[PDB]
């Protein structure tokens, strides 16, 4: 029933993601000195520190907004990868599976709580 519970749930999920070794390439913005043409392919950079900071600033209204930004981290990795077998891309697929497995109940509980609020 709690319309605000998603925020702490997302904080705890981001804590789990930061503990995951697979998140290391995604914890901070992609370095343009390491990948000079990054912005020629990727229009909207995103990373987990920017997601956490947006959440902690009170700049997400719902877990769907957070989920859209986290998914952008993974679609950027898929768009920039030179191969479907690359190391960083392979790490993003596992991390995406972990994130989707955990965010599902957060989204369901929030949407259910909001429907109850507007009943
Ligand atoms: F070299 C790559 C292979 C596959 C996906 C992404 C990259 N480089 C960009 C990046 C993203 C996060 N860390 N570095």
Curated annotation (Swiss-Prot):
Q: Where is the signal peptide?
A: none
Biological source species: Homo sapiens (Human)
Q: Which gene encodes it?
A: PHIP
What positions does the domain Bromo occupy?
Answer: 1-106
UniProt subunit comment: Interacts with IRS1 and IRS2. Interacts (via bromo domain) with acetylated lysine residues on histone H1.4, histone H3 and H4 (in vitro).
Q: What is this protein called?
A: PH-interacting protein
Q: In which tissues is it expressed?
A: Expressed in myeloma and epidermoid carcinoma cell lines.
Pathology noted in the entry: Chung-Jansen syndrome: An autosomal dominant disorder characterized by developmental delay, intellectual disability, autistic features, anxiety, hypotonia, obesity, and dysmorphic features.
Q: Which residues of the full protein are shown?
A: 1316 to 1434 of 1821
Give residues where Phosphothreonine occurs. 44
């Amino acid at each position: 029933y709690d319309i605000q519970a998603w925020k702490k749930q997302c904080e705890e999920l981001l804590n789990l993601i930061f503990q995951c070794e697979d998140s290391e390439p995604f914890r901070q913005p992609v370095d343009l000195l390491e990948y000079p043409d990054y912005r020629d392919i990727i229009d909207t950079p995103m990373d987990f520190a920017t997601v956490r900071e947006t959440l902690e600033a009170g700049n997400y209204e719902s877990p769907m907004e957070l989920c859209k930004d986290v998914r952008l981290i993974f679609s950027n990795s898929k768009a920039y990868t030179p191969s479907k077998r690359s190391r960083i891309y392979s790490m993003s697929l596992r991390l995406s599976a972990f994130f989707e497995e955990h965010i599902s109940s957060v989204l369901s509980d929030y949407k259910s709580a909001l429907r109850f609020h507007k009943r």
